[PDB]
Amino acid sequence: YGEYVQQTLQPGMRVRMLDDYEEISAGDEGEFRQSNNGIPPVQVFWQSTGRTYWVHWHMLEILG
């Protein structure tokens, strides 16, 4: 699933957290700010923590 999102994640679209993260909730949402091609943690601005954090593609979902 991480492959699928890595391909279709547009610079400025709406993302979703499908698993509980270090400062982010499962069910929390964000925006794609920028990613790394070879490095899987994409930085996305999460509304619950109010900041851009490192999350993995397989736990990154899009419902936007």
* Domain chopping of the chain, boundaries: 1-64
Contacts 24+ apart (CB under 8 A), 56-59: 56/2, 57/1, 57/2, 57/3, 57/5, 57/6, 58/1, 58/2, 59/2, 59/17, 59/18, 59/19, 59/21
Give residue 58's identity as a one-letter amino acid code: H
Question: Experimental technique used?
Answer: NMR
CATH number for domain 1-64, candidates 3.40.50.970, 3.90.226.10, 3.90.1640.30, 2.30.30.30 = 2.30.30.30
The closest of 18, 8, 27 to 55, measured between CA atoms, is 18
Residues linked to residue 45 through DSSP beta bridges, in sequence order: 31, 52
Q: How many Cβ atoms from other residues are within 10 Å of residue 32's Cβ?
A: 20
* 60-61 β-sheet, strand order: 51-55, 42-46, 29-34, 14-17, 60-61
Assigned token pair, 53: 């954090």
